[PDB]
């Protein structure tokens, strides 16, 4: 896998762009300035071996970059990146990790450390599978944890209910590993949105399978729980990219 | 109106972010580097009075920032910013001015010159209405011109057909002023999408009113012409934000 060019600049650029202009009305500005955020982010993996990281490596960074989240707009998703973000509509309906400062900054970027100066590899980065999980998921895992930890009020989770190989809810999806377990008592409810991809055999349904397990698990953490399959607002979104779909026939 | 803070940085940050990571697959990278683009952009209004600009002021900037545009997918819009961009889907379906380098960089930013050093005002900018049009629309007007001039093949135009005070097509909308008149012979057709806001009296219709005028006007410039009212892909998008709407009733 090839690392992102001019990581420093891309980071700082994205950071500044965010600071001054991005979710001015949806999310709070962070207190630390970009150079400070860069240092916290760099020390986390610089001059260490690419696989030399754990959930704590970016702790300082995430502490500096964590913004308070608006009650009720936090959204989590699993295996439905495009659908979840379209529905979230760039912080308008729900915010996603990708909409927060840390997420927006590192979204899609590729980087890794090396022990030799300059401290990070600019030619190549190890493959996912090469490193132990705690290093492999050190950044996005922590990001997800910090994010989830900050959720207030109702929280929303969109999952793929049409994937025969992957249950809607899984104890070891980033959600199951870092998001759900880190929801604080500030969280009120967990509303689930099950997505049934168009023209696809339905695999998961509310009150059944992993959704049924999640429900117990959620009420266990003492939160209210909701669940809906293809709510119209969302269905229509799916229909847009595939109008002919049988499930979109107009009255 | 208050100017954008750290204009320089925001501009350069946005610029770099774009360069390295933004529409890698949809749009070509520009040849000039960010510092060069900044100089062309700054000279255009720096050390002049806020109202001291004309269609030519940013000519150099736009020349350097103009990317070649994908055949058949350039989209233009009028009074339907949100609907047009959602449908365009960030360059996935159609690209819009805001998806191009110049647009992405200056989108939503506020700036103006002043004659005293540093050359631009950081406290306040004059109101739209205060300056002569050629200065007032110097930047976005030029941007629109340059953009339109680069369109090839089929071109798409989305308009509001539900606005009693503003006809779908107007000789003096930015489209009518800078986009339509600048379409080159590289343009094949002009497909129009009339938007009929949900639960709103329909005002304009294809083959009628301003749409009828546009049609003549288009065939005049020797382009083929299409027109559709609330095509399903788009209708569904409207329905997403308002499911109860009568026009969204499911079969
Ligand atoms: N940048 C990414 O690839 C990514 C993937 C999944 C969740 N958050 C970020
Ligand atoms: N190699 C990578 O792209 C990467 C991304 C995010 C966190 N850790 C590693
Ligand atoms: N995107 C914009 O800045 C813009 C400005 C004026 C008219 N239409 C769009
Ligand atoms: N930044 C601005 O105030 C501005 C005004 C008019 C056209 N382009 C930019």
């Amino acid at each position: 896998i090839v690392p992102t060019r001019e990581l420093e600049n891309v980071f700082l650029g994205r950071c500044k762009d965010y600071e001054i202009t991005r979710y001015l009305d949806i999310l709070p500005r962070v207190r630390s300035d970009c150079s400070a955020l860069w240092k916290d982010f760099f020390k986390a993996f610089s001059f260490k071996n690419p696989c030399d990281l754990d959930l704590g490596s970016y702790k300082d960074f995430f502490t500096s970059a964590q913004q308070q989240l608006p009650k009720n707009k936090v959204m989590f998703w699993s295996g439905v990146y495009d659908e979840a973000h379209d529905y979230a509509n760039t912080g308008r309906k729900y915010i996603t990790l990708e909409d927060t400062l840390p997420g927006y900054m590192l979204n899609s970027l590729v980087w890794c450390g090396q022990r030799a100066n300059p401290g990070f590899n600019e030619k190549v980065c190890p493959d996912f599978k090469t490193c132990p999980v705690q290093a492999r998921e050190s950044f996005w895992g922590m990001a997800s944890s910090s994010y989830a930890h900050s959720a207030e009020g109702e929280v929303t989770y969109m999952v793929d209910g049409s994937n025969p190989k992957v249950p809607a809810y899984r104890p070891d999806s980033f959600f199951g590993k870092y998001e759900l377990p880190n929801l604080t008592n500030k969280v009120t409810r967990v509303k689930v949105i099950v997505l049934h991809r168009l023209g696809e055999k339905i695999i998961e349904k509310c009150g059944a399978g992993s959704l049924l397990d999640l429900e117990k698990l959620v009420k266990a953490k003492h939160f209210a729980f909701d669940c809906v399959e293809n709510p119209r607002a969302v269905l229509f979104l799916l229909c847009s990219d595939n109008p002919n779909a049988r499930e979109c026939r107009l009255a």
Side-chain angles (χ1 to χ4, degrees), chain A:
Chain A
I1 195 171
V2 49
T4 294
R5 316 189 295 93
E6 308 180 43
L7 182 57
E8 254 257 52
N9 296 322
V10 172
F11 179 108
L12 292 173
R14 252 135 95 132
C15 179
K16 188 100 284 192
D17 179 30
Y18 194 103
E19 177 186 300
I20 312 296
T21 82
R22 291 309 176 173
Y23 295 78
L24 299 176
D25 282 315
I26 300 73
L27 296 171
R29 303 296 96 182
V30 95
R31 189 148 190 56
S32 327
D33 74 276
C34 294
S35 304
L37 286 169
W38 173 246
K39 285 169 83 160
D40 282 310
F41 173 72
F42 199 55
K43 69 185 191 190
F45 63 93
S46 66
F47 298 112
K48 303 181 182 188
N49 276 314
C51 290
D52 209 315
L53 313 166
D54 59 299
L55 285 305
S57 296
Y58 297 94
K59 180 173 184 167
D60 288 337
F61 172 68
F62 284 103
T63 296
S64 304
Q66 197 51 238
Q67 319 163 267
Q68 274 181 175
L69 290 358
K71 290 192 194 146
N72 307 335
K73 274 200 156 160
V74 178
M75 170 185 266
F76 298 105
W77 50 275
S78 280
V80 292
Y81 184 106
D82 297 304
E83 301 76 7
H85 289 75
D86 284 315
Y87 188 53
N89 195 205
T90 308
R92 259 177 283 171
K93 207 168 213 296
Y94 302 99
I95 75 160
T96 62
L97 181 58
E98 288 61 40
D99 296 314
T100 70
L101 181 55
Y104 181 95
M105 287 190 283
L106 295 313
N107 193 42
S108 310
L109 306 191
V110 185
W111 70 91
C112 56
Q114 72 173 33
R115 314 187 47 197
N117 291 271
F120 59 116
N121 207 314
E122 292 185 288
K123 273 190 61 180
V124 61
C125 283
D127 164 81
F128 197 77
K129 308 61 164 190
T130 305
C131 297
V133 258
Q134 72 273 187
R136 168 193 325 163
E137 312 183 337
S138 170
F139 180 88
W140 287 106
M142 184 61 246
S144 286
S145 304
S146 186
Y147 173 67
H149 181 77
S150 306
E152 294 174 52
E154 292 189 350
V155 140
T156 301
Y157 181 37
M158 190 173 314
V159 301
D160 186 351
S162 298
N163 187 163
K165 286 181 170 182
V166 188
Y169 167 72
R170 297 182 293 129
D172 78 318
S173 54
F174 267 49
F175 174 75
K177 293 187 286 196
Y178 315 108
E179 291 158 341
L180 178 53
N182 285 307
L183 298 186
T184 65
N185 63 332
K186 282 167 192 302
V187 172
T188 295
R189 171 189 310 274
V190 171
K191 313 186 78 133
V192 175
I193 295 179
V194 182
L195 194 138
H196 291 320
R197 294 168 174 291
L198 301 183
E200 303 283 292
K201 178 144 156 282
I202 294 180
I203 303 309
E204 289 268 28
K205 270 172 172 155
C206 294
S210 62
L211 275 355
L212 179 270
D213 295 319
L214 179 52
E215 175 161 8
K216 301 167 181 159
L217 189 40
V218 169
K219 288 181 186 179
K221 305 206 70 205
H222 293 150
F223 299 134
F225 176 102
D226 295 330
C227 184
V228 294
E229 315 179 3
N230 280 19
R232 302 199 304 134
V234 172
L235 163 59
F236 284 131
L237 233 49
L238 305 177
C239 288
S240 188
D241 283 294
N242 177 192
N244 277 53
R246 208 301 188 71
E247 311 91 307
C248 309
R249 306 199 318 111
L250 295 164

